[PDB]
Design a protein around this ligand. Structure first.
Ligand code: HQ5
Ligand code: MG
Ligand code: ZN
Length: 820
């Protein structure tokens, strides 16, 4: 054992020792309890980020903890490899996205290996390989036959300068993000998953997930957005039927979740595309213009409520079926065609959006709900205006006095008795559109034939291979310009036919990769039956909150689809979910000649030519050029320091501030750990660790054993139960502090010192395995992973007794107890 801690010496040896042992290469071992720990696999975009290292260290702590506890742990890693970045690099550097993707995969793989993650690299998948994506093409074809996947026209944002389709997130005031040209809205046929057939299932099964953070579950419920409401029909007034045809000339139909307030309706609102808007706009240019601007909008869902609500009166009227009052129809920009009837009623007194809209336009507000003795002011919204549970009806004639549910059913009955309405269940959830007009993605296994239609590719013929010898240009997705790809024969009649050239939403790869890891070389299905039965579901999933809605929903959806096909036998893919925090860092800048700021990367500054300006701390990103390269942290200090800093700086959910002093402190503590073992061995070598009856130990050594087995209990509860790793590390530091202040020089003192150190290096092994593996080998000759996780010695927690009273009519505890 050298005197000085040199991580570049020991970290490669430990990694080779673990790999030669095949500790992380696992099989379907029925004689060991399985544990599947999974971190959200990365985009291979070149280099690991510091947040990558935080995520995968967290995964590795939990994985190593269960390993030391005797679990057969699978911790797989792979590459979410399709997507836009490789096409961007291919337009920048003039290389093939596949060449760029694979070179990044190899580099990032070395990075992960140098960090010592206990990963089964024999289960590695790369989603851009045909061996992977053939199976999602296969699932596509099966669902297409059942109609769960279907084709229908949708509207897209066509950028006419860049010559490709843009998401709403890439449209800024109607203009493409890069080009700057006005977007065109175009209707093209695309493919959809009928995820709405699974709405109630995906909502209800959320209640099974007792170990999910409740905010993730709440976000999923709000996204599915089930509600139980009422269809209500408002008869069109005789004076308003001009230009209307069909049922639109008879009535305006609306959906509402608050039919108990229908006596409170003071106007109604329709979508820009509603027939009443069309009929009203026919002789009114201002309505025509209002409709045009609504159609030309690109309000993304995540911004829908941040949009300013606007409308225009149409001059048409409808009749409330309950009280007969005539309501003017307004066209409103917040009423969305395709969500239900594309038309709503408005009750300004008991709906905040209606309150704000009515206040802007001085539309009337009519109270029909009362709560307690609260004051109703028609000018100031109050939160009790929208209370359902604790409200009573007023100004509603027959319905006065009723609560929410009873008035609901009474309104239902009144409407049904007139044939003017009926109860109705709705979902905000939209079907999942998966067509992308992109090259670097999984081809859609459909062939178009003029006689046979859209036909799925036979399974015998899958994969439809994406040709990798392609360099995107900047004038359409290449596939549409490659007859060598799309020209083919019809698999049903053999005639002249064309392959679909759109590719799949890349969320699709990430919706089932956790099952592929169970048998990533299985050539006869998505996942082998024997492996799916053994591994079951993911026990622990770790990933960022940015994937808590879409990706998790899609993964849960795919799991039920695969279950329904008989490929798996679980309802839910992920049992426990941990959301790790972002990583932040200072920013630096220097003003430029044009009155702006040029952002300086922290690696290119000298702290304390001419200096730059220190600025505000935010998430590491290419936005303000403030990303700290994890590889430089590894080269300077070793993987163990990097791992420790990230786990000590902050609890997992909290954002982690980059800290140069924090890194140095992490390294100093690893130095201290090394010196403590070295000095313990330099005095008189290793001994058998203390065990058994501790009667006759001195108080000082009993107190060290108390602190020791207390620390083991604390750290076990922190790894397993609370998943708070920073407090586990400080608890081991406190143990070493007490050891430092204990004379352990006697025969019994050495035996207790051995016990302390053998436990400490095992307790820290999931955090810093390279140095602990090395120190454990100097202290004990058994395999660390065979010694296993430290066990708590309950006797070491028994305090000495002191009638006689244990350490847990006057009466003073521990001096007397005057019976008076
Ligand atoms: C399951 C699929 C949909 C995952 C998808 N490939 C993805 O997000 N890939 S990824 O490469 O973007 O990130 C992988 C993981 O690492 C975290 N990360 C990353 C970078 C960073 N600077 N800080 C972080 O915390 C990020 O939140 C995520 O949990
Ligand atoms: Mg349960
Ligand atoms: Zn045909």
């Amino acid at each position: 054992m050298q005197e000085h801690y040199q991580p570049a010496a020991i970290e490669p040896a430990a990694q080779k020792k673990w790999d030669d042992a095949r500790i992380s290469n696992v099989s379907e071992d029925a004689s060991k309890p399985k544990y599947y720990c999974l971190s959200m696999f990365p985009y291979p975009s070149g280099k690991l980020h510091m947040g990558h290292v935080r995520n995968y260290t967290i995964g590795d702590v939990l994985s190593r903890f269960k390993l030391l506890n005797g679990f057969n742990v699978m911790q797989p890693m792979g590459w979410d490899a399709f997507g836009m970045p490789a096409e961007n690099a291919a337009m920048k550097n003039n290389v093939a996205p596949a060449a760029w993707t694979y070179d990044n995969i190899e580099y990032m793989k070395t990075q992960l290996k140098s960090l010592g993650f206990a990963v089964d690299w024999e289960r590695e998948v790369a989603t851009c390989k045909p061996e992977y994506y053939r199976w999602e093409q296969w699932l596509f074809t099966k669902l297409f036959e059942k109609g769960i996947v279907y084709r229908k026209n949708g509207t897209v944002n066509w950028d006419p300068v860049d010559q490709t389709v843009l998401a709403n997130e890439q449209v800024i005031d109607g203009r493409g993000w890069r080009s700057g040209a006005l977007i065109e809205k175009r209707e093209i046929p695309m493919y959809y998953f009928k995820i709405t057939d699974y709405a109630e299932e995906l909502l209800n099964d959320l209640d099974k997930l007792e170990h999910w953070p409740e905010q993730v579950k709440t976000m999923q419920r709000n996204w599915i957005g089930k509600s139980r409401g009422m269809t209500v029909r408002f008869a069109v007034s005789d004076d308003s039927k001009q230009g209307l045809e069909g049922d639109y000339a008879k009535f305006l139909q609306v959906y509402t979740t608050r039919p108990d307030t229908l006596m409170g309706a003071t106007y109604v609102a329709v979508a820009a595309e509603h027939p009443l808007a069309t009929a009203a706009a026919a002789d009114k240019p201002e309505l025509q213009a209002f409709i045009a601007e609504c159609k030309a909008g690109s309000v993304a869902e995540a911004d829908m409520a941040t949009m300013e609500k606007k409308g225009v009166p149409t001059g048409r009227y409808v009749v409330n079926p309950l009280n007969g009052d005539k309501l003017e129809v307004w066209i409103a920009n917040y009423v969305l065609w395709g969500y239900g009837d594309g038309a709503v009623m408005a009750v300004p007194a008991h709906d905040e959006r209606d309150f704000e809209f009515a206040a802007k336009y001085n539309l009337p507000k009519k109270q029909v709900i009362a709560v307690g003795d609260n004051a109703f002011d028609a000018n100031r919204w109050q939160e009790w205006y929208g209370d359902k549970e604790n409200g009573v009806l007023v100004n509603s004639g027959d319905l006065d006095g009723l609560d929410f549910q009873t008035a609901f059913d009474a309104v239902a009955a009144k409407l049904q008795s007139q044939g003017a309405g009926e109860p109705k269940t709705q979902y905000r959830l939209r079907d999942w559109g998966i067509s992308r007009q992109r090259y670097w993605g999984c081809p859609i296994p459909i062939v178009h034939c003029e006689k046979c239609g859209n036909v799925p590719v036979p399974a015998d013929q899958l994969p439809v291979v994406l040709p990798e010898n392609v360099v995107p240009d900047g004038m359409g997705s290449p596939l549409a310009k490659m007859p060598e790809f799309y020209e083919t024969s019809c698999p049903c009649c053999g005639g002249a036919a064309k392959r679909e050239t759109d590719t799949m939403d890349t969320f699709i790869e990430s919706s089932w990769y956790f099952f592929r890891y169970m048998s990533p070389k299985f050539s006869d299905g998505m996942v082998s039956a024997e492996s799916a039965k053994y591994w079951g579901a993911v026990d622990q999933y770790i990933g960022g909150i940015e994937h808590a809605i879409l990706h998790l929903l899609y993964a849960r959806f795919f799991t039920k689809l695969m279950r329904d096909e008989g490929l798996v036998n679980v309802d839910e893919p992920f049992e426990r979910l941990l959301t790790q925090g972002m990583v932040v860092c200072e920013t630096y800048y220097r003003e430029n000649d044009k009155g702006g700021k040029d952002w300086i990367n922290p690696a290119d500054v000298e702290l304390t030519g001419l200096p730059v300006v220190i600025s505000g701390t935010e998430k590491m990103s290419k936005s303000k050029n403030n990303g700290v390269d994890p590889q430089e942290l590894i080269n300077a200090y070793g993987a163990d320091t990097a791992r420790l800093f990230m786990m000590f700086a902050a609890p997992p959910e909290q954002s982690l501030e980059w800290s140069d002093s924090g890194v140095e402190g992490a390294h100093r503590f690893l130095r201290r750990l090394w010196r403590t073992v070295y000095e313990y061995l330099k005095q008189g070598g290793a001994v058998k660790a203390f065990a058994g009856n501790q009667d006759g130990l001195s108080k000082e050594l009993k107190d060290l054993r108390h602190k020791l087995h207390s620390t083991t209990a604390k750290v076990s509860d922190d790894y397993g139960r609370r998943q708070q790793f920073n407090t586990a590390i400080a608890a081991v530091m406190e143990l070493l502090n007490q050891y430092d202040k204990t004379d352990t020089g006697s025969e019994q003192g050495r035996a207790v010192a051995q016990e302390v150190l053998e436990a400490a290096v095992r307790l820290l092994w999931p955090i810093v395995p390279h140095i602990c593996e090395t120190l454990w080998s100097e202290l004990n000759g058994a395999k660390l992973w065979e010694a296993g996780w430290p066990t708590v010695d309950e006797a070491a927690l028994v305090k000495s007794e002191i009638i006689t009273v244990a350490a847990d009519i006057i009466v003073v505890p521990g001096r007397l107890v005057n019976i008076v």
